[PDB]
Structure formats: structure tokens, C-alpha cells
Design a protein around this ligand. Structure first.
Ligand SMILES: C[C@H]1O[C@H](OP(=O)(O)OP(=O)(O)OC[C@H]2O[C@@H](n3cnc4c(=O)[nH]c(N)nc43)[C@H](O)[C@@H]2O)[C@@H](O)[C@@H](O)[C@@H]1N
Ligand SMILES: Nc1nc2c(c(=O)[nH]1)N[C@H](CN(C=O)c1ccc(C(=O)N[C@@H](CCC(=O)O)C(=O)O)cc1)CN2
Ligand SMILES: Nc1nc2c(c(=O)[nH]1)N[C@H](CN(C=O)c1ccc(C(=O)N[C@@H](CCC(=O)O)C(=O)O)cc1)CN2
Ligand SMILES: Nc1nc2c(ncn2[C@@H]2O[C@H](COP(=O)(O)OP(=O)(O)O)[C@@H](O)[C@H]2O)c(=O)[nH]1
Lengths: 244, 244
């Protein structure tokens, strides 16, 4: 058991947050001991919103760097913060409010593939394995101590889509354990190894270079496959079948 | 791994269904090989609906007994049917469409606690132990062969609300494994032991009988806690009063 009267602030977006909140409830964290910071209701985030509305769980949508956000966290007074696909950098002074600190879910084997488009870049780079890292948040992104990593094999048929979704599902499976690590004060271990970082641009502008081998082309196609976004171009190429 | 081109129809509602569709995509099931039956857009079922529009997964909200619903199944031609908290009895002829059969998630250890309110009756009866059952669907409700049961211990602090959500959370951790059993044709085992049944109504109309002992009133109060709904009622001098 998590302590009674442990206060938990979830900063999150979409299913992972919904699942976290659900998990917290099954662990016996009462509604008034839960608060959610999120973003406006949208096509990914309206399962979370409808839950918060139905159950009357307190929440904010205010920007991470705003006084209203800080005020929301300060009034709540969290013991721990759980970032579950939160889409902004959380300022240091906000994290400071949580005496038992925090955790974020990142869909790579950190410090490898920090940043954005991680599942795309892993496919493009031809990785045989990737994974997910639950790590403490310090004031920079994805640099804080590792509480839990798990390895996920990348299949030859995986797409950005397939791998993104398996990342979520498998990560949820460890979430209860990680909350319990945070509760017990587990310090985790500092990130060691070859860091890498990727930004918000898809490479080659989403465009196939025909001098690439069949192996580079297929990778790119599979890394670009993510409905409803447009696929790789040559014209619209969602599979290596079509490429031929 | 799931046999590729396996066509899967999910009958469901809310987070369990969203999680299921997420898992299936994570397992490499293509979008045109998924189809969903659900109900009209709800404050519980908003997550799912937006997922289905977003990824353009085909779906219906027609009634389970309707010709439109049956045609939706007919045209999709599922290999398997996954009921994740679907709220109607699915006609037998509709189940016959899936040649690898079906599975439903029920939150008890079947055959105990067939029917609605299983989480509340478990608490009311003073079970220290319950669980969830993934079972094949017969023409009748909650009778078919068991593919997977896991035990969930009940605490003295558990409410219907904490237990309901823990049921969900824990059941999701076994979903992939259940899907693979269906894929590989595990017939499961016949439900053994003595079947108990509980009425569709809310237990004792949510009203505390004062002939009950302290222990039975405590359980009932915990069994009745489920926000946003009304809690246990005590009536005093022909007058309704909600319990804390
Ligand atoms: C960790 C990062 O979170 C957010 O970005 P993210 O890349 O990690 O995750 P999302 O934006 O939700 O996108 C999820 C996946 O959706 C895919 N995707 C995202 N945008 C596109 C796109 O424009 N075209 C194609 N073909 N695919 C796209 C990527 O494969 C990506 O991994 C942002 O809020 C970033 O600011 C943040 N650093
Ligand atoms: N301080 C801090 N904030 C965190 C994380 C962290 O490790 N540290 N992890 C996540 C990082 N993140 C998203 O995962 C994210 C989102 C937007 C931007 C940005 O706008 N620049 C940067 C990072 C969420 N917020
Ligand atoms: N045919 C069939 N449909 C099934 C199940 C089953 O075992 N068999 N399991 C679930 C049973 N269920 C709820 O889980 C459910 C919901 C409403 C009614 C009803 O209204 N008549 C009956 C049962 C979902 N549908
Ligand atoms: N207190 C209270 N709880 C309810 C009510 N309706 C449903 N619930 C709870 O919600 C849980 C699941 O309900 P639901 O999925 O709607 O129905 P079921 O799966 O057919 O029992 C049950 O265990 C109930 O305890 C109500 O009117 N009052």
C-alpha cells in the first residue's frame, strides 16, 4: 500500500493519464487527494477530460509556465507529481512543491532518444530494441534519474504507429510498481551512456530518397506510418508493397 | 505473435475498450482489421469515440439486437470478438460470426457473482477475496469457458469505487496474454463450482436496514461509495439522509 493521505498530482494527456488516475483509485487514493494538470480537451485528451468531469476530480489546463498553474499545484500541495505524456516542460519551482519528487514516462531507453519522434527515429535507425524509461524530472527534459526501464523488442514489421501503441500498453503494465517506488523514496540511478536527441521535424521532410537501399526505404516508410498523418512520399507510400 | 490478417471486432465501452484497441495496434493489428461496437457517446465513452474518429477505425453504435448491428458484424467478418465492458447481451447469431470465438471481461471469479454490481455484492458479503474472469461468451450471460482468472484480494478499506478501478487496472495487465490464447484456440475450462446471481437493481435500494450489525453497515456504506452517484441512504423519521 501507498500511504493513506498521500496527495498525488498527475500532469498528463490522453490514455496514459486516464489509466494513471484509474490506477491511483484502485490503490485507494481518494478523489480529494488527486489533482490533474492537463491541456485543453481534444481528439486525444477527451477520455481524460470526461473522467475528470464525471468524477469531479480537480484539474487545470493552464500553461506550465503560468502563475495559475503554479497556484494550482501550490493549493493542492502534492506529495508526488506523475507526468504521463504531459506536453510542456514543467518549471523547477513547481516540481519543488512535491516533497517526494516526481516521475515522467519517456518512450525510449534514456539517455538514448531523448526528445520527440522517438518511435520514428528508432525505426529509421534500424534499432532491434528500444524501451521505456520512468525517470524523475529535474528542470531539464528527460535527464533525471531512472526509476524503471523496460526493454521492448522492435519487430521488422513495426511501424511508428504499432510501436507507439505497444509503448503505451507495456508502460501502463509497470505503472503501479513505479508509483510505489516513488512512495518509498527509491532514489533511482543517474543516467549513464550515449545520449542522443531529436527535435520536432520529421527527417527528409517525409520524402523518400531513391538511392537509399530497400532497407532504408522500408524503415522510413514504416517510421512514417501513423494515421491520420500523411505517410512517406515519392506518391503516398504507406507500405513497401506500394513502393513496388 | 498474433497471426497476421486476424480480424478483431471489439465490443466495448470506455477505457477498457480504448486500452484494448491500443493493445491490438501494439500487437501489429492493422486498422482495417479492427472494428468496434459501442454505445452512443457518453461521459464514460468519450475517449473511445474520439480515438475511433481520429484513427478512422470503423464502428457502429447500433443496438445489439438490431439488424444494423448484425450487418456491421457480417461485413467486417471477424475472426474473434472481444467484449470489453459492452453493456448489452450480444445475440448468439452475432457470436457465431467469429470462428475463433470470443471473450468477455467480468469482474468476479466466475461462476460466483454472475450479473451486475459484482464489486458491490463482494464487499457487502464480506469477501476477503475476489478477482476477474476472461471467459468465452455463450448465448447466455457470464456462463462460458474461462480463459484466464486472476485473484484480487479485498481490503477492509476498499469501496466499490476503489475495487472497480483496481479490477480494471489489473485485468488490463493480462489482456495481451488473453488475446493470444484466443488466437491460438485455447478452449479454456468449463465453469466449475456453484453459481451465485445478483439482481440488476441497486442492492437494498441503497438504503441501510437498521437491523444490520455494525460490520454489515460498514460494508454496505463501502459498497455504496461510487462517485458521482448517491451514497448509502439512512432514513430517519420517514426522512432521507445521505451518509458521510
Ligand atoms: C516528448 C515530446 O512530447 C511531444 O512530442 P512526441 O514526439 O514525443 O509525441 P507526439 O507529438 O504525441 O507524437 C506521437 C508520435 O506521432 C508521430 N507523429 C507526430 N507528428 C507526425 C507527423 O507530422 N507526421 C507523421 N507521419 N507522424 C507524426 C510520431 O511518430 C510520434 O512519435 C511534444 O509535446 C514535444 O514538445 C515533447 N518534447
Ligand atoms: N522539467 C521537466 N519537465 C518535463 C519533463 C522532464 O523531464 N523535466 N519530461 C517531459 C518533457 N516533455 C515531454 O515529454 C517536454 C514537453 C515540451 C517541451 C518544450 O516545449 N520545450 C519540452 C519537454 C514533461 N515535462
Ligand atoms: N451473449 C453474451 N453477451 C455478453 C456476455 C456474454 O457472456 N454473452 N457478457 C457480457 C454480459 N453483460 C455485461 O457484462 C450483459 C449486459 C447486459 C445484459 C442485458 O441487458 N440483458 C446482459 C448481460 C457482455 N455481453
Ligand atoms: N452507488 C451507486 N453505484 C452504482 C450505481 N450504478 C452503478 N454503480 C456502481 O458501478 C459499478 C459498475 O457499474 P456498471 O458498469 O454501470 O454496471 P454493471 O457492470 O452491469 O454492474 C458497480 O459495481 C456499482 O457499484 C448507482 O446508482 N449507485
Amino acid at each position: 500500500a501507498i500511504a493513506p493521505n498521500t496527495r498525488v498530482l498527475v500532469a498528463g494527456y490522453g490514455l496514459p493519464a486516464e489509466f494513471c488516475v484509474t490506477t491511483l483509485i484502485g490503490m485507494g487514493v481518494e478523489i480529494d487527494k488527486i489533482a490533474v494538470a492537463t491541456h485543453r480537451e481534444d481528439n486525444r485528451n477527451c477520455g481524460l477530460h470526461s473522467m475528470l468531469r464525471l468524477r469531479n476530480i480537480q484539474f487545470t489546463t493552464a500553461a506550465a509556465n503560468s502563475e495559475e498553474f503554479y497556484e494550482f499545484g501550490a493549493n493542492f500541495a502534492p506529495d508526488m507529481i506523475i507526468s504521463m505524456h504531459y506536453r510542456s516542460l514543467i518549471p523547477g519551482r513547481f516540481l519543488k512543491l512535491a516533497k517526494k519528487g516526481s516521475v515522467n514516462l519517456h518512450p525510449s531507453l534514456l539517455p538514448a532518444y531523448r526528445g520527440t519522434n522517438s518511435v520514428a527515429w528508432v525505426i529509421i535507425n534500424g534499432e532491434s530494441e528500444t524501451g521505456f524509461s520512468y525517470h524523475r524530472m529535474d528542470e531539464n527534459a528527460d535527464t533525471g534519474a531512472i526509476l524503471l526501464q523496460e526493454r521492448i523488442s522492435v519487430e521488422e514489421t513495426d511501424t511508428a504507429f504499432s510501436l507507439f501503441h505497444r509503448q503505451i500498453a507495456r508502460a501502463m503494465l509497470r505503472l503501479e510498481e513505479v508509483i510505489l517506488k516513488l512512495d518509498q523514496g527509491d532514489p533511482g540511478f543517474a543516467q549513464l551512456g550515449e545520449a542522443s536527441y531529436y527535435a520536432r521535424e520529421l527527417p527528409f521532410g517525409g520524402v523518400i530518397d531513391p538511392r537509399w537501399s530497400e532497407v532504408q526505404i522500408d524503415r522510413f516508410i514504416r517510421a512514417m506510418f501513423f494515421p491520420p498523418f500523411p505517410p512517406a512520399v515519392l506518391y503516398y507510400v504507406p507500405s513497401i508493397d506500394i513502393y513496388r
